[PDB]
Design a protein around this ligand. Structure first.
Ligand code: CLA
Ligand code: CLA
Ligand code: CLA
Ligand code: CLA
Ligand code: CLA
Ligand code: CLA
Ligand code: CLA
Ligand code: CLA
Ligand SMILES: CC(=CC=C/C(C)=C/C=C/C=C(C)/C=C/C=C(C)/C=C/C1=C(C)CCCC1(C)C)/C=C/C1=C(C)CCCC1(C)C
Ligand SMILES: CC(=CC=C/C(C)=C/C=C/C=C(C)\C=C\C=C(C)\C=C\C1=C(C)CCCC1(C)C)/C=C/C1=C(C)CCCC1(C)C
Ligand code: SF4
Ligand code: SF4
Ligand code: SF4
Lengths: 138, 69, 161, 81, 730, 73, 74, 74
């Protein structure tokens, strides 16, 4: 679009990213900082430049937009930041939430790791027959 | 400045998305309901798939004196 | 005026594909395609139905009257209808039970005009089932029928070759 | 399960050990004593696809995960599009 | 590594476990690294992170090919000499049926050794020495026995130039990293100064020493070992000692001549190997160019130049890194070298360049399929190594926004098209045949696709063939016949033993093979194209250049996430091409014998190895085992107890080896593990296993031992199938 | 195919081949209701097989008959 | 008589497999190590590494020894 | 003639069954995949690494079996 033209992450063309299923469902987008005008690598095959604004490129799907890191942290910078856009708003605040950098401690959140019994002798197969009254919905 | 020609007619320009033909020939409601029954479509298709397809196949296979396989 | 439009990948943002080259969006083509269901929905799907039914209609003749199974027919029921007044029928409900991937159930009538449309979010759907009927209903009377001024037209022919 | 592959181990230390794997694994959730004290097996897994990049590195000493999730969204395979 | 680096030991590294990435082969024992070591032995992501050497190795460990090609050829000249049959065959061609190899009668052997011509026991040949060898402006068995050691000379020496590199303290960068001249030289004087030099030893000596062979004699009743000096007196019969001309130019008079050359085209009646009176002129007329040509130039300049609108801005700059790649400037090459080999495979059979070929059937189709599998085995390669580029070679990303960065820009695109191309073909390009079956087995020919039922009418003719054999009436000068006797217009009389070439007619059953090739050539390439293109990044995996261009498969997720990569696109692209070539072969001989090869007698009533059975009957794809595979092959499965027999007797193995590939191709991996332990167990009880942790095959090794087998199986199968239906009738 | 193909290669060009439609006229809006994918990573070990088999078992089927019938025996 | 020995040889082989294949499902969905043990269905599991080996030793022998005799013969 | 085929139908159900016996004799698990269960049968595939792991579900050995049941029964 143009009448509102708010860009940041230079490119030109490409038959790569974003297409029909990022309106009709979910969206996904990454944002970042940077020093001085530098030419990057890109998801979707292509390659462009930087300088600033928000530095806010929008991306098809979120495995796509963290790979700015799996190289886009072999090119300086603390700060890179991807969220989740809908076709209307929120819940799923993606790189938002609390702290960041997967490998610190504030809280614990989810995860667990165990099931009922732990890795130990599950030569014990599948137990009860699946029946609506004994704690196997987890 | 001659070749500064003030863009020999700007155009306006961008024509439009605006308006480079009127529309569709006036031939229409010269079919109003004419051929309806897919213009009475209000519950059908089951009707045209026994009917039409029992008469693209009923007589369509049968024949009074072969001209064989 | 420029190097080729105000030079652009898409309408605008280059993170959608389309790579608007020619063969995509040259006023040379994009106008050869919008009295019809390309950019904008004229009248309803009602009428477009038969110019679609019919045009696609009188096709499929020499395809199955000159390449017919035992070809070059001496049967007065071929060089035309014959059977193929089957294709249009095998596919005039190849459609209807795709307009069951459309339901959305209404009745507005807005094929008359109001305020210079947009149909706005006109992309995605925004053509309910009571639309896709009046088209694939235009299809049958466009298919079957469009098969006969094929047939009906004698045949003077050349080639060739 | 819907993403249930066990990479657990016993150290769950993550230094020169393992990090790799698109989003899925926001751990370091120190359980009250396990050496370099960061533990368990995951965080909130309803986000990403089905790697085993998950081990490949840093022990699971038993199995290692892979696809087993079945119930499988799309966001959970690249292609919902 | 680490070991002694320094400065402080000539003392060589023999002893101390390992080397090749760094928690290397570890102290701790294993087997995988023994296929490691051989595989990827040559590679470059290890040895050093620094160009430098590598080009300093590849210019050496190159060398030892030439030297080898050179130890080879020797045992072939020697072989084509004292294990004679060449002397015998030449006074006596049309007659002989040549040999070079012979057994020694150990164990069963001897059956393999079965009377071949000038009176001796041996195993035949389909490798046309004895026919380059026509050449010998001299003849003599012990002579080839000099050409032979002349071979081992070039070798030892053109093999001590490889000591006289890497091992000697080497050149460096500039030397190649100034490219500036390279082709300047190469094409000018060797490309030139050979073809040139070849001219001088291609009329001087050879022409005359088969100008009056094409008649009779018994050698040394002709062509001495020196005779051809100053003596420009026998050069008297085959044109002037220039008489009054001086160094071409014009103030020359011809009231009756025009130097040797006097251009031919056609085929010697008595030796239809195409004329030699030409063969000088054409090599001469080459070299000049090369002689003029290799005189560019110094680089960018010319490519740093023509751009456009949609064209290639990066055209301009099309690679600094084309002095800094290899893997790039190898892959380009293979496409050409390779694609420029199977263009041989035609101009050969429809224009023989050696005396006695065509008549010699089997001693130039072997050729046209050997040359044919390189102009293909070298092309999939020519893709692999681009993938090897596309993934890694350069240091960083310094290369930017150009012709490529362009092509990629579209990429879900160039390969978006090409795809539909193939299913359009395939449906027009194979089920086409299947019509026939389904409707000829239904049976109503009225409506097949026969060279006669679907409308085409007793002529093919009017196209371009018919404006080729007929073109010696343009700007064309002329010279009786054409260019390639196989063209539409005129002439017949070709040879007095058997046959050679004649028109070769078309229409349908030539129309549609010719099209299956399309679809076969195309879907081959789809998979290599999209393969090398999507080399490093994608919307199935973007984190996807992170190891190398191999890697097994990323992981069970994303749905599949297995094949991907591009080792593997260059694994399923071999898989096709084995067809690409394997069906093109199938084409040529079924033609070339169904028509052409066959034979004259009175009124030259032509009698093909097969009265054109092709006609109405390759069009049916069963006819392709009715008329082919089950027809011919009856010579393979009759071949026991004979002389060739080694073919039928291969044709079971290798028609086994293939049917062993599938096991390597079709199977898991922690499988043969899960198995390899049961084994490892029983092993330990007796106390007999652990040391060197026995391990199953390295996911992609496994694919390596598919494929490679599937080919050396599925291929020599016909290598046998063939030599067994041209030796013996045909 | 099923057997030397392995979902990875198939899915991916369907990733490019489902950029068509979406990007081509007279075939847009036109929605699938099932998302174009490549066969499951067990499924095709089956299907090549359940395919390998009929072929194979439908060949001796027609082989023996087609020759115990003629004969000679 | 010869397209009837075999639709009963195919099948029959085709079974056997499925036989052997629902008695490697018992071991996973059903089966119960605490409820079967010292017990002779176990031990069968337990003393298993041998079982495939003294099986594989049959094949490998039955392998190359058939195949000496048949190439040699060819 | 019969003292061979008769040893090569014997190399079939043996090989066919070292794989079915095996297939079965641990749909439970093993060294490479120890805890191979709660789903045992068709979990075909696993991640790369460990040694490299593949058609090592008791189904894919069944899967693999059915080729020799299609080679004996031939
Ligand atoms: C100009 C060409 C040429 C050169 C110099 C190279 C050089 C190279 N290639 Mg390469 N390649 C080529 C043509 C060439 N290639 C072609 C035509 C293809 C298409 C098939 C390939 C496909 C290819 C692949 C897929 C790979 C390479 C790789 C490599 C690198 C690894 C070399 C190595 O360890 O040897 C490898 C050779 C062996 C380990 C020997 C095994 C040979 C077996 C298979 C025998 C062949 C069958 C034969 C009939 C057996 C002998 C007879 C027997 C029955 C007695 C090296 C830089 C590899 C790499 O990782 O890049 C760094 C990668 O593996 N190439
Ligand atoms: C005689 C009987 C017998 C019985 C009563 C059962 C019963 C069962 N089997 Mg089973 N099975 C049998 C023989 C039997 N099997 C044999 C002989 C084999 C191999 C020899 C198998 C191999 C097998 C496998 C792998 C599995 C089962 C499974 C099952 C369970 C689910 C069934 C299923 O998945 O079908 C649903 C299938 C369909 C609705 C149709 C798809 C099937 C495809 C493969 C078609 C097969 C070929 C076909 C005829 C070719 C096409 C025809 C052509 C002319 C067009 C159920 C407990 C599953 C299970 O629960 O295990 C955990 C599963 O894993 N079976
Ligand atoms: C014709 C086929 C080919 C060959 C030769 C084999 C051979 C074998 N398969 Mg096999 N397989 C094949 C195709 C083949 N398969 C296919 C297409 C599939 C399905 C896709 C399978 C699925 C399969 C399974 C599930 C299993 C096997 C197993 C086996 C082994 C069983 C033991 C045996 O039979 O004696 C031993 C082998 C032979 C008689 C073959 C010859 C091997 C020697 C004699 C090699 C010759 C040496 C030679 C002189 C040196 C040349 C090498 C080089 C130096 C040039 C055996 C190695 C089983 C196994 O692992 O057993 C323990 C079992 O795992 N196969
Ligand atoms: C010989 C036989 C048979 C016959 C009698 C016809 C007759 C006709 N075809 Mg036709 N056709 C045939 C076989 C046959 N076709 C086959 C096998 C195919 C394969 C696709 C076609 C594909 C085809 C197409 C795509 C079209 C026709 C068109 C036409 C009609 C327009 C005549 C014209 O040129 O416009 C006269 C135009 C002006 C005077 C202006 C005409 C009634 C159409 C057409 O010809 O319009 C140009 C339409 O173009 N045909
Ligand atoms: C046409 C083929 C050919 C040629 C010219 C070469 C050439 C070379 N190979 Mg090589 N290789 C080949 C086929 C070939 N290989 C094949 C088929 C394999 C099986 C995978 C290998 C596996 C291999 C390995 C593992 C190594 C080499 C290495 C080398 C280089 C070492 C030279 C040396 O150290 O002393 C020359 C010594 C002698 C002449 C002594 C006599 C020995 C006998 C064989 C003669 C040399 C460039 C070494 C390397 O990395 O260098 C590039 C390395 O160690 N090769
Ligand atoms: C390109 C080939 C290569 C190959 C495959 C062969 C192959 C052969 N040579 Mg040979 N040879 C070669 C190069 C080769 N040679 C070279 C370069 C020379 C020059 C030394 C020779 C000199 C030579 C002699 C003198 C003999 C052979 C013989 C043979 C045959 C037996 C050779 C052998 O090693 O055991 C056996 C065998 C066909 C033997 C032969 O001629 O009769 C069968 C004879 O022993 N060769
Ligand atoms: C993309 C952009 C730009 C544009 C808009 C064009 C447009 C054109 N080029 Mg072109 N060209 C360009 C850049 C461009 N070129 C560049 C950079 C190069 C060098 C790489 C060329 C090299 C080139 C050649 C050799 C030719 C063209 C031709 C053409 C014309 C096609 C003929 C036609 O439609 O009338 C025909 C209409 C009829 C009714 C008949 C068309 C006007 C062709 C031409 O000269 O016209 C045929 C000719 O083939 N171009
Ligand atoms: C796996 C086994 C098998 C066995 C048991 C044999 C056994 C035999 N083979 Mg034999 N062979 C085999 C496979 C086998 N072969 C295969 C697969 C091939 C193809 C590569 C051959 C190709 C072959 C040949 C060409 C010859 C034999 C010969 C022989 C006999 C010579 C042994 C000898 O000289 O003893 C003497 C010493 C002691 C007994 C001590 C012996 C009866 C030789 C024979 O003379 O015919 C029977 C002959 O040389 N074999
Ligand atoms: C040194 C010389 C030389 C030469 C010459 C030469 C230097 C020549 C060369 C040539 C080359 C050639 C002629 C080539 C060849 C090649 C070949 C033959 C190959 C073939 C093939 C193919 C086709 C492919 C692959 C395979 C093969 C290899 C088989 C000289 C020098 C000089 C001087 C300085 C002084 C004075 C004199 C002179 C003389 C002036
Ligand atoms: C059984 C066997 C074998 C078999 C075998 C078979 C059953 C098969 C094989 C095969 C092989 C091969 C096959 C190789 C090779 C080769 C070659 C030389 C090739 C060549 C070529 C070329 C050049 C290219 C392509 C084409 C062709 C192939 C022709 C053996 C066995 C045994 C025993 C008893 C024990 C001890 C050891 C032995 C003594 C060993
Ligand atoms: S075993 Fe893996 S990820 Fe698990 S605790 Fe260690 S490294 Fe953490
Ligand atoms: S292993 Fe699983 S959870 Fe971990 S990264 Fe891979 S997919 Fe995600
Ligand atoms: S390797 Fe095996 S498991 Fe891994 S991906 Fe490929 S297939 Fe899947």
């Amino acid at each position: 679009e143009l009448d509102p033209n708010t860009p940041s992450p230079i490119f030109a063309g490409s038959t790569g990213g974003l297409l029909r299923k990022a309106q009709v469902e979910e969206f996904y987008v990454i944002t970042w900082e940077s020093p001085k005008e530098q030419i990057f690598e890109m998801p979707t095959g292509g390659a462009a430049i930087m300088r600033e604004g928000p530095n806010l490129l929008k991306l098809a799907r979120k495995e796509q937009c963290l790979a700015l890191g799996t190289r886009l942290r072999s090119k300086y910078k603390i700060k890179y930041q991807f969220y989740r856009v809908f076709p209307s708003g929120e819940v799923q605040y993606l790189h938002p939430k609390d702290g960041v950098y997967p490998e610190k401690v504030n809280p614990g959140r989810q995860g667990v790791g165990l099931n009922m019994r732990s890795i130990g002798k599950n030569v014990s197969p599948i137990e009860v027959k699946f029946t609506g009254k004994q704690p196997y919905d987890l | 400045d001659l070749e500064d020609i003030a863009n020999t007619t700007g155009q306006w320009d961008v024509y439009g998305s605006d308006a480079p033909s009127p529309y569709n020939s006036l031939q229409s409601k010269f079919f109003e309901t004419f051929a309806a029954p897919f213009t009475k479509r209000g519950l059908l298709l089951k009707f045209l798939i026994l009917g039409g397809g029992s008469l693209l196949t009923y007589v369509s296979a049968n024949a009074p004196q072969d001209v064989l396989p | 005026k420029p190097t080729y439009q105000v030079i652009q990948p898409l309408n605008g943002d280059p993170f959608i594909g389309g790579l608007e080259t020619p063969v995509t969006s040259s006023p040379l083509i994009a106008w050869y395609l919008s009295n019809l269901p390309a950019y904008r929905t004229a009248v309803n799907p009602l009428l477009r139905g038969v110019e679609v039914g019919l045009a696609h209609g009188f096709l499929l003749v020499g395809p199955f009257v000159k390449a017919g199974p035992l070809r070059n027919t001496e049967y007065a029921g071929a060089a035309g209808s014959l059977a193929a007044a089957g294709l249009v029928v095998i596919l005039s409900m190849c459609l209807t039970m795709y307009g069951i991937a459309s339901f959305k159930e209404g009745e507005p009538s807005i094929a008359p005009a109001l305020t210079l449309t947009g149909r706005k979010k006109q992309p995605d759907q925004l053509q309910s089932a009571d639309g896709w009927a009046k088209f694939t209903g235009g299809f049958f009377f466009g298919g079957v029928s469009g098969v006969t001024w094929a047939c009906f037209l004698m045949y003077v022919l050349d080639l060739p070759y | 399960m819907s993403h249930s592959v066990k990479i657990y181990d016993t150290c769950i230390g993550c230094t020169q050990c393992v990090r790799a794997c698109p989003t899925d694994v926001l751990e370091m959730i120190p359980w009250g004593g396990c050496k370099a004290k960061q533990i368990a097996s995951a965080p909130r897994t309803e986000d990403c696809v089905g790697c085993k990049r998950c081990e490949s590195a840093c022990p699971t000493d038993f199995l290692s995960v892979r696809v087993y999730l079945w119930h499988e969204t799309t966001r959970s395979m690249g292609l919902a599009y | 590594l680490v070991d002694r680096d320094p400065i402080k030991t000539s003392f060589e590294q023999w002893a101390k476990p390992g080397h090749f990435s760094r928690t290397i082969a570890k102290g701790p024992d294993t087997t995988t690294w023994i296929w490691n070591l051989h595989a990827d032995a040559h590679d470059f992501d290890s040895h050093t992170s620094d160009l430098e050497e590598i080009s300093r190795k590849v210019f050496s460990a190159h060398f030892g090919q030439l030297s080898i090609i050179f130890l080879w050829l020797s045992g072939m000249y020697f072989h084509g000499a004292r294990f004679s049959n060449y002397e015998a065959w030449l006074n006596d061609p049309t007659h002989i049926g040549p040999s070079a190899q012979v057994v020694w009668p150990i164990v069963g052997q001897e059956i393999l050794n079965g009377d071949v011509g000038g009176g001796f026991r041996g195993i035949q040949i389909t490798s046309g020495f004895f026919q380059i060898w026509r050449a010998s402006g001299i003849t003599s068995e012990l002579q080839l026995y000099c050409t032979a050691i002349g071979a081992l000379v070039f070798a030892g020496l053109m093999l001590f130039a490889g000591w006289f590199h890497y091992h000697k303290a080497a050149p460096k960068l500039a030397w190649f990293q100034d490219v500036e001249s390279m082709l300047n030289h190469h094409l000018a004087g060797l490309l030139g100064l050979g073809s040139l030099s070849w001219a001088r030893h291609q009329v001087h000596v050879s022409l005359p020493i088969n100008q009056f062979l094409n008649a009779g004699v018994d050698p040394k009743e002709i062509p001495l070992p020196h005779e051809f000096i100053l003596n420009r007196d026998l050069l008297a019969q085959l044109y002037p000692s220039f008489a009054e001309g001086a160094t071409p130019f014009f103030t020359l008079n011809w009231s009756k001549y025009a130097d040797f050359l006097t251009f031919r085209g056609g085929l010697d009646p008595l030796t239809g190997g195409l004329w030699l009176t030409d063969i000088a002129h054409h090599h001469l007329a080459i070299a000049i160019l090369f002689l003029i040509a290799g005189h560019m130039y110094r680089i960018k300049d010319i490519l740093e130049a023509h751009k456009g609108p949609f064209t290639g801005q990066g055209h301009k700059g099309l690679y600094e890194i084309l002095t800094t790649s290899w893997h790039a400037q190898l892959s380009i090459n293979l496409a050409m070298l390779g694609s420029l080999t199977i263009v041989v495979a035609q101009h050969m059979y429809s224009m023989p360049p050696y005396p006695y070929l065509a008549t010699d059937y089997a001693t130039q189709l072997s050729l046209f399929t050997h040359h044919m599998w390189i102009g293909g085995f070298l092309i999939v390669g020519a893709a692999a190594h681009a993938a090897i580029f596309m993934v890694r070679d350069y240091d960083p990303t310094t290369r930017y926004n150009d012709l490529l960065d362009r092509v990629l820009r579209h990429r879900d695109a160039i390969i978006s098209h090409l795809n539909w191309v193939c299913i359009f073909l395939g449906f027009h390009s194979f089920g086409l045949y299947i019509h026939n079956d389904t409707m000829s087995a239904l049976g109503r020919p009225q409506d097949m696709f026969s060279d006669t039922a679907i409308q085409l009418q007793p002529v093919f003719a009017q196209w371009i063939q018919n404006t080729h054999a007929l073109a010696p009436g343009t700007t064309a000068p002329g010279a009786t016949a054409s260019t390639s006797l196989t063209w539409g217009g005129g002439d017949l009389v070709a040879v007095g033993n058997k046959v050679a070439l004649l028109p070769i007619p078309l229409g349908t059953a030539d129309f549609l093979v010719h099209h299956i090739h399309a679809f076969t050539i195309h879907v081959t390439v789809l998979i290599l194209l999209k393969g090398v293109l999507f080399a490093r990044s994608s919307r199935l995996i973007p984190d996807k250049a992170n190891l190398g261009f191999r890697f097994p498969c990323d992981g069970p997720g994303r749905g599949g996430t297995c094949q991907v990569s591009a080792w593997d696109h260059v694994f399923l692209g071999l898989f096709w091409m084995y067809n690409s070539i394997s069906v093109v072969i199938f084409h040529f001989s079924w033609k070339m014998q169904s028509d052409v090869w066959g034979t004259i007698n009175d009124q030259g009533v032509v009698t093909h190895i097969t009265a054109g059975n092709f006609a109405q009957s390759s069009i049916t794809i069963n006819g392709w085992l009715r008329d082919f595979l089950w027809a011919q092959a009856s010579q393979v499965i009759q071949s026991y107890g004979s002389s060739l027999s080694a073919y039928g007797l291969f044709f079971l193995g290798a028609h086994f080896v293939w049917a062993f590939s599938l096991m390597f191709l079709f199977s898991g991996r922690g499988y043969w593990q899960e198995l390899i332990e049961s084994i490892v167990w029983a092993h330990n009880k007796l106390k007999v296993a652990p040391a060197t942790q026995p391990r199953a095959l390295s996911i992609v090794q496994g694919r390596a031992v598919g494929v490679t087998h599937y080919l050396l199986g599925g291929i020599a199968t016909t290598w046998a199938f063939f030599l067994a239906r041209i030796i013996a009738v045909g | 195919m099923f057997l030397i193909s392995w979902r990875g290669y198939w899915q991916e060009l369907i990733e490019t081949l489902a950029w068509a439609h979406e990007r081509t006229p007279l075939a847009n809006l036109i929605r699938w209701r099932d998302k174009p994918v490549a066969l499951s990573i067990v499924q095709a070990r089956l299907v090549g097989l359940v395919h390998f088999s009929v072929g194979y078992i439908f060949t001796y089927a027609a082989f023996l008959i087609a020759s115990t019938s003629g004969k000679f025996g | 008589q010869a397209a009837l020995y075999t639709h009963h040889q195919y099948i029959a082989g085709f079974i056997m497999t499925g036989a052997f294949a629902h008695g490697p499902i018992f071991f996973i969905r059903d089966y119960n190590p605490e409820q079967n043990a010292d017990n002779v269905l176990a031990r069968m599991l337990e003393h298993k590494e041998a079982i495939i080996s003294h099986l594989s030793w049959a094949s490998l022998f039955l392998g190359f020894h058939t195949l000496g005799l048949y190439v040699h013969n060819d | 003639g019969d003292f061979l085929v008769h040893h090569a139908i014997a190399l079939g159900l043996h090989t066919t069954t070292l794989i079915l016996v095996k297939g079965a004799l641990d749909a439970r698990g093993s060294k490479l995949m120890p805890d191979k269960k709660d789903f045992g049968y068709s979990f075909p595939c696993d991640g790369p690494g460990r040694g490299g792991t593949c058609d090592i579900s008791a189904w894919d050995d069944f899967y693999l079996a059915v080729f020799w049941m299609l080679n004996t029964i031939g």
